[PDB]
């Protein structure tokens, strides 16, 4: 379909656009987590005592611990949504689709993209926080009370599987675009121009993975298989989030997040 | 720079401007002058309702709000078109990534205004890739703040269009605006001004050859370019009040974010 030079051109454009949209890249994330650096070294939060020390050193709040951590996640999810929305507008064709479908695409795409990109901040042991100045261990989160502990762990369960593919940012730039331009989102009005955009992005992705991971067979297929998984991990996330917002009146959802979930 | 090099640079920008922008000034002017397949005319409430049904808008979920949202939709599309075109300006893509973002951030409004003049005459503006034409008098007549939000763009376009620039003139003009070294927060001004000096040389030579009878056309066009600065700040002020006064103009949070 599209000539190789044209698909590579699209790859560069999306990567270029991804760097400009997302503050904390996967390459930076790994430089912080992989050490051999004194300047990019994170403060590690692994228990109540180090959390309290963390509020002074890192500088990110009268509520309980698990709530405070939850709002720190959602604050960051909200910014991600803003960041993903800005990235979407740079995808060729996105801003020319029917305005209703843009909203529909973001509405159903932002959560899947957040999980994908949260994996970049994670290893088996914890997650980068506060633009990489902090690092909160998996076990500390898992140990949070009532429902909140099991609300945090599935994000890690995914990331460990997802990071095994060993993608870099230039791969993620195309993958993330493919997710947004899904024609099977409920309630879309013109599936066809959305599918046309995704076809080029898929072509661009396949070529990119072949070139950047030549010794890695069927990475395309393996990467697409993870992409539909996200559908269920997301609804399972919304399931827990719905039950949480039943017990907890001290949770406030952000209006941006709120509207995404009314649907 | 050698004269041949300025002509090559002018040609490169024109060729690129044609690939980036769907509806050129020459196509627009054939349509507005009855020299072409006639556009649907929106001149009042009743023709507006017929027009969204015939013309088929993509902005469509009060009247003045909906027209406002169609302007916003089209501006967002323009921003991506200008962004693509920028990558074709020699040297742009080698600048620091942050400075690229800063230049586009402040340049898009001035270019949108400038290029909107291409779609306008004294009596209205082309919409929907030239298939429609919405009259100035209808736009001026919209209620509360919206009427006076629309008219200043026409007041600019009429003055700007008196310079009678073509697409090959504009192709360089737009490049010069983008490569403004005085944008707030730039990290490395020197290569931005170095490129703008080249663009300015090419513009000066372009205007002399394409408008030999037009003395100080260069100077007059640079004067408009700085006008754009204040016209844009007045625009963003009104634009801020609209998405602030009209709380129903802060509709869906997603939509709000799309138009942040
Ligand atoms: C300052 O305190 C902190 C403490 C721990 C972790 C972090 C940073 O966490 C993130 C960082 C980024 C980013 O920077 O890209 C994106 C997403 C999350 C994140 N979000 N999230 C949701 O539950 C979530 C999600 Cl996925 C989507 C929508 C809404 C929500 C919500 F509202 F319900 F929260 C997590 C659950 C568990 C974990 Cl470990 C991490 C997360 C900060
Ligand atoms: C029902 O649908 C329509 C009704 C009327 C006109 C149009 C097409 O209008 C355009 C076409 C093109 C293009 O295709 O090149 C570029 C810019 C505008 C446009 N933008 N604009 C802004 O206010 C504006 C500006 Cl200048 C710069 C940045 C941001 C904004 C914004 F966000 F606030 F909108 C206008 C105000 C009045 C008018 Cl008459 C026209 C415009 C469609």
Residue A133, both tokens = 């100045």
How would you classify residue A182: left for phi > 0, otherwise alpha for psi between -120 and 50, otherwise beta? beta
H/E stretch holding B139 reads: helix B136-140
Query: What's the CA gap between A69 and A80, in Å, rounded?
Result: 17
Residues contacting residue B48 through CB under 8 Å, at least 6 positions apart: B42, B63, B67, B138
User: Where are the alpha helices (H) located in A164-254, listed in sequence order?
Assistant: 169-180, 191-212, 219-247
Reported as half-sphere exposure (CB side, CA atoms, 13 A), residue B210 has a value of: 21
Tokens of residue B253, six digits: 């949070």
Ligand that lies nearest to the alpha carbon of residue B238, given by its number in the listed order: 2
Question: What's the Rg (C-alpha) of chain A?
Answer: 19
Q: Quote the CA–CA distance of B226 and A122 in Å, as a whole number.
A: 48
Identify the CATH class of A3-263: mainly alpha
**Cβ distance B82 to B108 under 8 Å?**
yes
Angle at B192 between CA B190 and CA B198, to 5 degrees: 105
**Among chain B residues, CA nearest to A104:** B254
B80 closest CB neighbour out of A90, A102, A106: A90
Cβ of residue B76 closer than 8 Å to a chain A Cβ: yes
What distance in Å separates the CA atoms of residue B51 and residue B66, rounded to the nearest whole number?
13
Write a three-state SS string for A21-43.
HCCCCHHHHHHHHCCCCCCCCCE
Q: Pick from B61, B65, B254, B259 the residue to mutate for testing the A interface (most A CBs within 10 Å).
A: B254
Q: CA-to-CA distance for A210 and A4, rounded, in angstroms?
A: 12
Contact between B181 and B193 (Cβ < 8 Å): yes
Beta strands in A25-93 (DSSP E): 43-45
User: What distances in angstroms separate CA B174 from CA A262, B123, B179, B203, one per listed residue?
Assistant: 43, 25, 9, 10
Classify the phi-psi angles of A93: left when phi > 0, otherwise alpha if psi is within -120 to 50, otherwise beta.
left
Q: Which 3 state secondary structure label does DSSP give B4?
A: helix
C-beta separation of A136 from A66 below 8 A:
no
**DSSP at B187:** S
The two tokens of residue A203 are: 């072509």
* Elucidation technique: X-ray
Instruction: Determine which helix (DSSP H) or strand (DSSP E) holds B89, and give its type and residue range.
Output: none
Q: Which residue in A11, A20, A27, A17 sits closest to A211, CA to CA? A: A11
Environment class of residue A165 by beta-carbon count within 10 Å: exposed (0-12), middle (13-18) or buried (19+)? Answer: middle
Q: Which of A88, A52, A57, A68 is nearest to A148 (CA)?
A: A68
Q: What share of chain B is helix, strand, coil (3-state, %, to 5)?
A: 70, 5, 25
Query: How far apart are the CA of A82 and the nearest CA of chain B, in angstroms?
Result: 7
Interface contact flag, A99 B253, Cβ < 8 Å: no
Q: Are B102 and B186 in contact (CB under 8 A)?
A: yes
Distant-in-sequence, close-in-space partners of A43: CB < 8 Å, separation ≥ 6: A50, A53, A54, A57, A58, A133, A134, A135
> Rounded CA gap, B111 and B182, in Å?
16
**Cβ pair B59, B73 in contact under 8 A:** yes
Resolution attained, angstroms: 2.3
* Per CATH, domain B2-260 is 3.30.390.50: no
Instruction: Return d(Cα A92, Cα B93) in angstroms, integer.
Output: 18
Q: How far apart are CA B115 and CA A213, in angstroms?
A: 43
B241-246 long-range contacts (CB < 8 A, ≥24 apart) are: B241/B145, B242/B68, B242/B145, B242/B146, B242/B149, B245/B145, B246/B65
For residues A139 and A128, give the distance between their C-alpha atoms in angstroms, rounded to a whole number: 14
**B111 in Cβ contact with B178 (< 8 Å):** yes
For residue A41, is it left (φ>0), alpha (ψ between -120 and 50) or beta?
A: beta
DSSP state of B125: E
- Whole-number Cα distances in Å, A164 to A24, A46, A213, A221: 20, 24, 13, 14
Size of interface A-B (CB pairs under 8 A): 56
Of A71, A77, A151, the one to substitute when testing ligand 1's pocket (max ligand atoms within 8 A of C-beta) is A77
Report d(CA B109, CA A45) in Å as an integer.
Answer: 45
């Amino acid at each position: 379909h599209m000539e190789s030079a044209d698909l590579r051109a699209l790859a560069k454009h999306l990567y270029d656009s991804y760097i400009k949209s997302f503050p904390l890249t996967k390459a930076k994330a790994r430089a912080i987590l992989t050490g051999k650096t004194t300047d990019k070294s994170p403060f590690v939060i692994y228990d109540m005592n180090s959390l309290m020390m963390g509020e002074d050193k890192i500088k990110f709040q009268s509520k309980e611990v698990a709530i405070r951590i939850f709002q720190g996640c959602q604050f960051r999810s909200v910014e991600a949504v803003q960041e993903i929305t800005e990235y979407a507008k740079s995808i060729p064709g996105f801003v020319n689709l029917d305005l209703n479908d843009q909203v529909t695409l973001l509405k159903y795409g932002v959560h899947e993209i957040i999980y994908t990109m949260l994996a970049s901040l994670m290893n088996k042991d914890g997650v980068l926080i506060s633009e990489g100045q902090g690092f909160m261990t998996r076990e500390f989160l898992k140990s949070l009370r009532k429902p909140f502990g099991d609300f945090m762990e599935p994000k890690f369960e995914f990331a460990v599987k997802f990071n095994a593919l060993e993608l870099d940012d230039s791969d993620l730039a195309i993958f993330i675009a493919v997710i947004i331009l899904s024609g099977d989102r409920p309630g879309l009005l013109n599936v066809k121009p959305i599918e046309d955009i995704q076809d080029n992005l898929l072509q661009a992705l396949e070529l990119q993975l072949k070139l950047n991971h030549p010794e890695s067979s069927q990475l395309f297929a393996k990467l697409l298989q993870k992409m539909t998984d996200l559908r269920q991990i997301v609804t399972e996330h919304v399931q827990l989030l719905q039950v949480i917002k039943k017990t907890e009146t001290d949770m406030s959802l952000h209006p941006l997040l709120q509207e995404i979930y009314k649907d």
